[PDB]
């Protein structure tokens, strides 16, 4: 559960991400596939090579979804209902994998935005990604 201040931190930090949202999403995915190779099993037909246009394309989708989630931080289950059905009902992603991607997103943000990645913002972003993860791993139709 996010505090009011958490929501403000998340909006402020993701705002600073801005036009780089897609690049960062692609980098987070690359970090995840390399650091936690078991995650690649969810993408068996993907070109997962470094610089993959397919991974870059997917990174943008992931980032845009997060931007949507930030925009609807008070109403995330409704905002993400389609994505939840995809990840929880169709793909059946083990929830551990969401912890791995969330970590890799934090690493990506820390690497690119060190001034912005204060302890308080780090904490708020971790909670936000956990909240997104819970929605995407829930079947609530």
């Amino acid at each position: 559960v996010l505090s009011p201040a958490d929501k403000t931190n998340v909006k402020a930090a993701w705002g600073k991400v801005g036009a780089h949202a897609g690049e960062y999403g692609a980098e987070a995915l690359e970090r995840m596939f390399l650091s936690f190779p078991t995650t690649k099993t969810y993408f068996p037909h993907f070109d997962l090579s470094h610089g993959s246009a397919q991974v870059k394309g997917h990174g943008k989708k992931v980032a845009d979804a997060l931007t949507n989630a930030v925009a609807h931080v008070d109403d995330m289950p409704n905002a993400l209902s389609a994505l939840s059905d995809l990840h929880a009902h169709k793909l059946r992603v083990d929830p551990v994998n969401f912890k791995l991607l969330s970590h890799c997103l934090l690493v990506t943000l820390a690497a690119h935005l060190p001034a912005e990645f204060t302890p308080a913002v780090h904490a708020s972003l971790d909670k936000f990604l956990a909240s997104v993860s819970t929605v995407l791993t829930s079947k609530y139709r």
């Binding site: 980098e27 970090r31 990645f117 302890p119 308080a120 780090h122």
Partner: protein, 146 residues
């Protein structure tokens, strides 16, 4: 934990740049801020009421230095972590009863701190090598639970 020669070289090169007086305290401090139940284990450390209080707490910084020292020692004994960390495992598991998921959290907070400090140097292959190391350390610390 087995590292390729390329991974070992990359891990060592990054670690040589770590500020050993500060990075452990930053990692420990962020653990206490991001995962606040971990503060229960550090009641004697004084003011942990705000992120600023945590990060500037002299006992957090000092203790952090010890933690980092343990990671540094681990880097020199990657093939014998269960042996190296046996005393620490008995302390954290049998005496303090720290749930082992917290070992994983601290390792990943340390990785976030390395990313924060070294940015473009903390490439995905370098991160992957460090994830092997912190997983190895968390596993060795949790050994008494296995």
């Amino acid at each position: 934990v087995h590292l390729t020669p390329e991974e070992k070289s990359a891990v060592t090169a990054l670690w040589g740049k770590v500020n050993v007086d500060e990075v452990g305290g930053e990692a420990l401090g962020r653990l206490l801020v991001v995962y606040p139940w971990t503060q229960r284990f550090f009641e004697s450390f004084g003011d942990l009421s705000t992120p600023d209080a945590v990060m500037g707490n002299p006992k957090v910084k000092a203790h952090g230095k010890k933690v980092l020292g343990a990671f540094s020692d681990g880097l020199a004994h990657l093939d014998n972590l269960k042996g190296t960390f046996a005393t620490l495992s008995e302390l954290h598991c049998d005496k303090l009863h720290v749930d082992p998921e917290n070992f994983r959290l601290l390792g990943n907070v340390l990785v976030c701190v390395l990313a924060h400090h070294f940015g473009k140097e903390f490439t995905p292959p370098v991160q992957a090598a460090y994830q092997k190391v912190v997983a190895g350390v968390a596993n060795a610390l949790a050994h008494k639970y296995h």
